[PDB]
Amino acid sequence: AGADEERAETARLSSFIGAIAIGDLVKSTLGPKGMDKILLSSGRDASLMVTNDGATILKNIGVDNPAAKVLVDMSRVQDDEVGDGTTSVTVLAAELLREAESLIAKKIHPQTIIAGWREATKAARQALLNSAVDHGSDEVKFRQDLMNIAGTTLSSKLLTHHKDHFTKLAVEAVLRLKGSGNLEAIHVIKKLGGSLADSYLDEGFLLDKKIGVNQPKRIENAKILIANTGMDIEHAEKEKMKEKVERILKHGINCFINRQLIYNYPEQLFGAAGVMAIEHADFVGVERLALVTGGEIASTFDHPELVKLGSCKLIEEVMIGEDKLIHFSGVALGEACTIVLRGATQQILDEAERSLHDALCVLAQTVKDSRTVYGGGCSEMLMAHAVTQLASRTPGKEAVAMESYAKALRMLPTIIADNAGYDSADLVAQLRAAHSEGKTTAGLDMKEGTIGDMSVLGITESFQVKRQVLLSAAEAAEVILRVDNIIKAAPR
Amino acid sequence: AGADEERAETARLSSFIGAIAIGDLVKSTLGPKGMDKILLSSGRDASLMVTNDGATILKNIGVDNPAAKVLVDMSRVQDDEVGDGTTSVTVLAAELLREAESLIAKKIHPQTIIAGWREATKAARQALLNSAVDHGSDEVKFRQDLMNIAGTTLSSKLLTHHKDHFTKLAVEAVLRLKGSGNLEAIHVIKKLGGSLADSYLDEGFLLDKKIGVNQPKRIENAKILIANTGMDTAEKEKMKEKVERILKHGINCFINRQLIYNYPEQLFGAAGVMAIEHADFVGVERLALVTGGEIASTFDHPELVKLGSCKLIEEVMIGEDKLIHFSGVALGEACTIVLRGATQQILDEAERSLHDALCVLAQTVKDSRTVYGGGCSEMLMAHAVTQLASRTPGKEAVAMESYAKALRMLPTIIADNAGYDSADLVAQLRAAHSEGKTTAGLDMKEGTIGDMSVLGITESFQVKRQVLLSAAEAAEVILRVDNIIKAAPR
Amino acid sequence: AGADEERAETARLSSFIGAIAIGDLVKSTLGPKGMDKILLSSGRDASLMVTNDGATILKNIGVDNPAAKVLVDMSRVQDDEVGDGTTSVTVLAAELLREAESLIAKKIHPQTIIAGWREATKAARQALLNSAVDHGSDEVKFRQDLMNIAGTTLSSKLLTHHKDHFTKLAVEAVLRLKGSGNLEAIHVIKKLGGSLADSYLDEGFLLDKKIGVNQPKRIENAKILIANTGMDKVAEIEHAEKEKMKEKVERILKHGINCFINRQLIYNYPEQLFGAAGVMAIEHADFVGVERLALVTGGEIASTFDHPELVKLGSCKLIEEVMIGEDKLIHFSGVALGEACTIVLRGATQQILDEAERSLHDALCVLAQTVKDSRTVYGGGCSEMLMAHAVTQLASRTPGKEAVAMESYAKALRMLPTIIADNAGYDSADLVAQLRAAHSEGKTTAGLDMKEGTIGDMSVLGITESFQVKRQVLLSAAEAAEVILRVDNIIKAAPR
Amino acid sequence: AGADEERAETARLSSFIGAIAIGDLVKSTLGPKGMDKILLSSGRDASLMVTNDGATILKNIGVDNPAAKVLVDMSRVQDDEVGDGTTSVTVLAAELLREAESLIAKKIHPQTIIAGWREATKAARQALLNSAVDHGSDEVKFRQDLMNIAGTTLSSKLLTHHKDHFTKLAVEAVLRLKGSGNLEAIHVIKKLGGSLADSYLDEGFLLDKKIGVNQPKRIENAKILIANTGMDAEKEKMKEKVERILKHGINCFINRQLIYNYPEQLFGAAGVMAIEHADFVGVERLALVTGGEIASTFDHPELVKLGSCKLIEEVMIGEDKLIHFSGVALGEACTIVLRGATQQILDEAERSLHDALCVLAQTVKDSRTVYGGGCSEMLMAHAVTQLASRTPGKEAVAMESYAKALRMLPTIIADNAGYDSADLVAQLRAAHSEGKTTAGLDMKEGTIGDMSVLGITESFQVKRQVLLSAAEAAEVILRVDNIIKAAPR
Amino acid sequence: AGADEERAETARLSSFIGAIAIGDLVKSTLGPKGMDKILLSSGRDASLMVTNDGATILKNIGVDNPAAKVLVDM
């Protein structure tokens, strides 16, 4: 009873406890019926932060003494190349530690057990495409573009009553995204007001800056000017003023965008002319705009006329249910487009700044991968039936490592059933029988409380989440299990 | 949170902890690789006692706050009609608690789960007699009398070097005592002197006493007199009544259970009669069944109301201690085994094992059925029970599967106390049983798997049927009782 | 603020700790230059008890909570079938625990190693029948009466200088004693003076008492009387006292009474009578001597003054009060029975002369069966080195697991040569290697000669060990100590 | 001062405790079944660092009062000029301290026991000398150059899935440098940019620097100039440098310090490639390669300078620009150079090439190796046990205690395999006694097998350094007189 | 008992409490005989604002640990 001082057995437990504590908070977030949580902290925190995405909160806060923060940091790298959907990778790693309890009972070299990871690779061969799956999106694709994985990513997120519609909108954005040059030039801004649609799709670019209170409300047959150099004895200044206007009247210029500080003198002049300019426009938006507007060659005040190409469908500032912004539309190119999101309404609403970035990635993979797997636990039960056989028929050493890996899969069906509110035990017996039969389409239906046809619901998981999780699941852990717990010092 | 008031889920956990703690101490006492343990206490304990037998130590002390004393008390009722062998019933009852963790996931009501226990009855019935119990042990029996179950009882006891030979001797004792209808006339004394044989079998009853330093050494065509009332009590009249009745009978030996009066004693020496003073009553009762008995009352006791055996009564040196031998009983039903041994705590240890060796063998003759030991029975049942869970509809299936799962730990427990990797042992073990060989089991000495029959290890059939149905009913009452509230006695 | 708090590996330590504590006290005792320790306790203890014999002290006291009393109890059975010599069985068992530190390093299954204990069954038995060389003793035996094992038992004792002579004396005591009669009525005492002999042999039983200053110097064809009850117109009553006197003298004369011994106070009137008559009486005689004496004299029925004549059986040879150099003591001697006999050692109130009494009981046991066994082995550790050279071979011979346990047993014999030499006052390191070469060569007689400072001929010295002590020690020790390490953990829980 | 004064048994104990703490952490790290380890520490570490190689972690941190740090420090000297492979030198040294508890029973003085070390030589020498182990290493050798010990050093480390091949490359480097002692002038670098083989072999030395944006890309029949003093009226310095330079035909300038701007303009037009703040370690090694020169003041060019004129150029081999020095006339010194895939594993390759390099140079020249998997150790145990009986008075005590120590090593290897060592300990003993030096513990087998088939051989140097260092440390602290102040610093 | 530690079901109660706490202040305002509330805040606030309009006051301040700010914004 009691005692804190780490050597031998105590060493494993600190890592063991860290893994179990995080699993309960993340478990609620999995699949179609996930949950949203709020957190409050003193240092560099304003109020409770509610993030649906597990990865965002783990990076943000280092709450306590036990070791687990380093494991958390690594997940971000995964996010850049795929990331989100639902947070499941951390959970599988945590459950790996649970049978370590059985390891003391084993009473043999813990490190020998590492051969189990090699064994896991054997499991991996068996794991690979043995579980029917779904063929996936051809490229662009009609119906299969969405009403799939994005909805699942959203399911945990607190907005899915109307949000699933929003997700459906997002695949349209990804299809246009491919071809130009991987992923950049994507920007979306949320709106503080609610509507049934809850989102508008723009054919151009969305920006939020204004020259000043004075100037005409809207421009047509717009000409766009982009300058690298700022507009920045007093009589000599007037010459700078005049050159700007002289070149400007001739073109018919409707809008001027400059990436940096804008000199005050021209501003007075623009208002009389009827030309709208933007001060300190961000470079990333501008560069994107150039693709959209046909581009410009930006240099010194010589920049006007022919060296400048400007799209002209329409540039205007449009009131959008509350916070108004400038909309660039009708781009001749058509290659780059912008999405405007409207939120449920709350602190959660501002996540839309970088939420889309997480959203773009799951949809982009679905269209790009051209492969998928069946949703709501369909994949997990089928694989579990196959793995149980494998341990029994491999004699001696080979059998112990494979069997332990196999039971890990059983918990996932239950986690989905438990968040459903239906009985987990009733669910387990019925679930296994349908998968055993051979119907890969059949899966967990939370709404029913019983097993049903997953395909009818339309919930499917993309192919990348299943192959990648399996490859490094057994590689990240092995460096750690090679070790018991840490070297000399007198920690904590 | 954290301070002793318990309700619902917190109440269940205390029961859970008590079961796990007991299993680790008892596990080391299973089969051929079992071990001896010594416990020390202060306050009405005398000091340090060693108990190989799990049941004896558990009954003696209620050590701490967790609740398990009542569960412990039950094992003794089992012991008189079967008991011992090896202690396995407590372990199986304890492991049933582990499934309760999966139970929280079930999250509603554990009670309909109980239906699983009757499902368990099919599993219980299905594999313990399904391999090859054996056929025989019809009566007295030549070779098959031992080098079987007694050895297994001894298996849990390390002393089984010299000791397994001792075990072999015990069945000879059971053949005369067979029936177990009435267990009585068996007396064993350990002797302080080392020898390879370690024990001697006496054709009768062994007792340590002498009249005094006078009186004849040996009697033949012996007549035996036992008196309920003492010789203690004009005095000459008591003397003459005793002599007159005595001479006609030819009285060879007199045994009295209490104080003896001196006047009689002078008489006995000249007469040629050997008398015993303050002989223990329990020996006397056993003796009565043995010699046809007698009615013990006042000095009218001699002649016909008394019956006496006619073979041989003499005092014979045993090792380093002087004892008297009663033998040649006409009845033949009751006889005595005398232990010798090296002499130490262990020699006193044999006292603990006597009332263990005797019970197991008695049961083996009556059941006429047995199962393969060394864990052979346990792995086979596990393979068969896995199929059953899949067959049954749903909720029942969930409960049926969990019971099957528990059998897996036993192969592990035998290997774990043996000295070989538990993980490696399980994989190789299952393949042997799966194949179809009943004889094959766990060979602790080997470190792998082998033929159990060669070693001579078998388990009584009766221990296996009783453990299965009884465990179900006992487990059923604890899940059913959720609220346990108690305070310190006084 | 206290507690016992121990788990898993610490539990192992409790078995470990008991063995180390016992070994340090006993090691000094072993061999020719042994050490004597006095133990004093209060509360159901009297004073100054010092025991040379390791077995006697361990049995008497259960000092503390850790387990060790049970291991101790085993040694007494060994003592019954052969006895002592020097205490060594406990020491070897203790060192077996040291390998367990190695066992954590082993880090597999400590119980698997326990298989070695099974192996020890074979290890102990090859130890048997094999080893030391000697022969037999016929009966009575002139030269071979002693100058053998008693010197060996004594070697542990600080006593062996003048005392080896005392030891020689003890077999004379056994020769008169010999038979299967028992070890009965053997009494030996000590006296406050210094002489080369340092001891004397009394014909039969020693008692420190006298009737009074007056009375005959000695009695012959003596009759011995033992009484349970004590001797304890106005003028006629004084006359009546004389009546008690009358019965005592008139029937005392018919018997021929030469000595009266009473275990209590004695009335003064009879005392005058005994002196004139020629009869020697003893006031407040010790009861323990009396019961023992009765076996010697054939006994008697001790009741009221009716006690004389036939109910009394006195043995007659010589009862006298004799000079023991300083003070004077009375010798019963000449017992017809022959079953019981006595010898006298000299020292008294020295400091530890009472340890001699403790020393004495174990020493007597050694001599009594030397004649009965008729078999012995060479002393001075000659027997121990030879067996040790042989056992190294054995560990290699047994496969796998068995070799580790058998090899440990072999090193146990090595320590004895070192202990014998170390207390001698010579360098232990030099002694061990020179010793091994002589035994290896093939000479059984050669052994450790402490006075020499090197190796010498044991047979000339007169030091031997009973064949029985070596056979039994190897069998019983292995099987009995087997029990101790078969159990790794001894615990329970908590009190408060 | 500090004044921590050591007394008899309380002096010995500090040495005893240090040895036990090190052994448990290092034991799991050994050979094929070797494992990576992580550490979190007080003070300035703030996080968990993972180093497979035991030596790297021990030098970085000096955690507590007893001094084991100095024992630790010694292992690096071994690592730079021989070294690693598997960490066992520290483990064997630690195990000998346990016996000292036994030694108090002996109770004379430690020094008498010290006789064991003369006999450590006789018992052990027989042990190394029990023979086979080393094929012979003829000199260079077509296939025995590797796929042996370097591969095993890598085995404890993960990079081995594709880096076993990298290890193979390293032996080629050692063979060309054989003779005149050992190691000098060996260096290794890694480049970001993937290839399946993951390596490029350079016949010369690899340096990562460039003169500037301008200057000829490739130089031919190059002359090398090394200056002890930096380039840093001003025009006169410019004039002296140009006049001397043209006659020599100087194609490259290497200076170990800061370089002045004026000469730089001249070098581009001249056709001479110069290197700013060149590393001294590369230069000294390079000097053996180019024949060297005496570096003085600008008077230095021509005869007082000796340059090698084969081929110097800066080559784009992938991503980061590097400069290749090639054509060593001496032949005594060469480099190697490594490539990768662009992975964490690749940077680990840098960690183990050093490990591979040191082992082979010593393995080839010493003409000795030992059988791994405990083959050498059990055989050694059998020979030593009879030896104690053989020795006289003062000889027969020290040797006997040393002999039982060897017994533990077979046991440690069997457990890390996972099989029961009890069965293993004497089954193993019977095979060594028989006469097969090639037989030993087979971790993969789970019992005993043929070590030679496995291909695990240990450098003879790794085994001598460990055994001698093992108890010398034990005997020195117990003796310690008039200790002064405290802390290794 | 004795602590403010809360999880899952007890956790729900804090959400529960926020809704009840807001209702008592607002109810007085809801009709033809309302009260009037002032609310003075210390730290980066300009004077105490006394508001009879319930919507205006809930939006202006995020007073404490319990969560109700998000309900208010809509």
Curated annotation (Swiss-Prot), chain B:
Enzyme Commission code(s) on record:
3.6.1.-
Phylogenetic lineage: Eukaryota, Metazoa, Chordata, Craniata, Vertebrata
Q: What is this protein called?
A: T-complex protein 1 subunit beta
Q: Which UniProt keywords apply?
A: Acetylation, ATP-binding, Chaperone, Cytoplasm, Hydrolase, Isopeptide bond, Magnesium, Metal-binding, Nucleotide-binding, Phosphoprotein, Ubl conjugation
Q: Which residues carry this modification: Phosphoserine?
A: 47
The organism is: Bos taurus
Recorded catalytic activity of this chain's protein: ATP + H2O = ADP + phosphate + H(+)
Q: Does the keyword Thylakoid apply?
A: no
What Pfam families does UniProt report for this protein, alphabetically?
Cpn60_TCP1
